[PDB]
Amino acid sequence: VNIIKKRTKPFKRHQSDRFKRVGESWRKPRGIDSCVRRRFRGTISMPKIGYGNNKKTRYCMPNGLKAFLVRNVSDVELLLMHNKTYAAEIAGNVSARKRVEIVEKARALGVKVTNAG
Amino acid sequence: VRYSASPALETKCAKARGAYLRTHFKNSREVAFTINGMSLKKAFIFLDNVKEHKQAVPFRRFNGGVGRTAQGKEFGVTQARWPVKSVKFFYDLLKNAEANAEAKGLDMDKLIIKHVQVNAAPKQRRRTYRAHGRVTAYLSSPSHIEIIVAEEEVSRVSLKQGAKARNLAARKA
């Protein structure tokens, strides 16, 4: 069971390209005369449940693991039992000292780190 | 204040700054774009010529309504002008920049204008009076000018490709 993605490009909001007050984050068009809502040919496509990915490969990184957010060594030891399913990912706000402690614990636990570098 | 350019390390470069200068920003942009990349002495000669109506500063971007002139042909354009006030400010800043190079200890012969940028300063708010009891803006567009002068300054081979290369090498020699 290899990781496949049904779709790789994101769903951008209609006219987010043309207007800066309209961000790219998706919004369902409610217009009475919307081309995208009526799904005309050539217009952009909308999120559907059919686009959903395999439950087996969902949430998994291309390497087959799931990133798990880590704050300290206690969060690393949580991944003691699942080093072959989850990969530790150190939080942004962790200081340099606790980061070095987290990586050394992850290496000893044999847990991969997504942002080790 | 930090400059626009990552270069201009103090080794061989001199700087000049002008803030909130009461001159037209659009004219100053045309002067800066004209003198960009020219040597210091030739820049002085050109600015003197513009002040004397012998050479002209081409108006390229902000050229709406400008007239055609025979002195814009040297730059390949038709619209050019002689903004004396902007020429004065650039002349004064270039005097300052060459003075800084003298203090630093550079060579004046090969000095070139490495970088020159003009930014819009905060507007100056004034007032005009229109018909029918209406009052309207009469704002001034100042200029920030900053000048920087400076001196002029494996693949790996697959198995079959390697065998073929060896065969050709042996057969040629």
């Binding site: 798990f68 957010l69 206690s74 949580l78 003691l80 039992m81 290496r107 000893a108 636990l109 044999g110 | -």
Partner: protein, 123 residues
């Protein structure tokens, strides 16, 4: 009261050993074997269960009883191993053969990985 209602109260949603995420929850229980939130593996929720943790190059194993469940201080018994990983595996399934054997595989995994944790710490 009983083990079922204890699990219904704690476990499921709120516990000091629960770590919920996107859709998955971990059991940081220092008495859980697998680290998963379950009736099978939460000694708080269920009766006598085993577990193992590490300290300073050697391992210790926790055990429980039933009649002494009202005395928290002396409820839980510790046995200490500082000999070998193979011997540690021998001790665990020996101390669980007369016991509900469902935990032998999960425990022996914990012992063997914690020993690998120690070897990687040395390397």
């Amino acid at each position: 009261q009983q083990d079922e209602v204890i699990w219904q109260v704690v476990g499921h949603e709120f516990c000091s050993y629960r770590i919920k995420g996107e859709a998955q929850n971990f059991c940081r229980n220092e008495y859980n074997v697998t680290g998963l939130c379950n009736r099978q593996s939460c000694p708080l929720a269920n009766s006598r269960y085993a577990t193992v943790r590490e300290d300073n190059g050697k391992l210790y194993l926790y055990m429980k009883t039933i009649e002494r469940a009202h005395f928290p201080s002396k409820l839980w018994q510790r046995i200490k191993l500082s000999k070998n990983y193979a011997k540690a595996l021998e001790q665990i399934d020996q101390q669980l053969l007369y016991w509900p054997g469902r935990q032998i595989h999960r425990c022996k995994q914990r012992l063997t990985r914690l020993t690998q944790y120690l070897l990687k710490a040395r390397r």
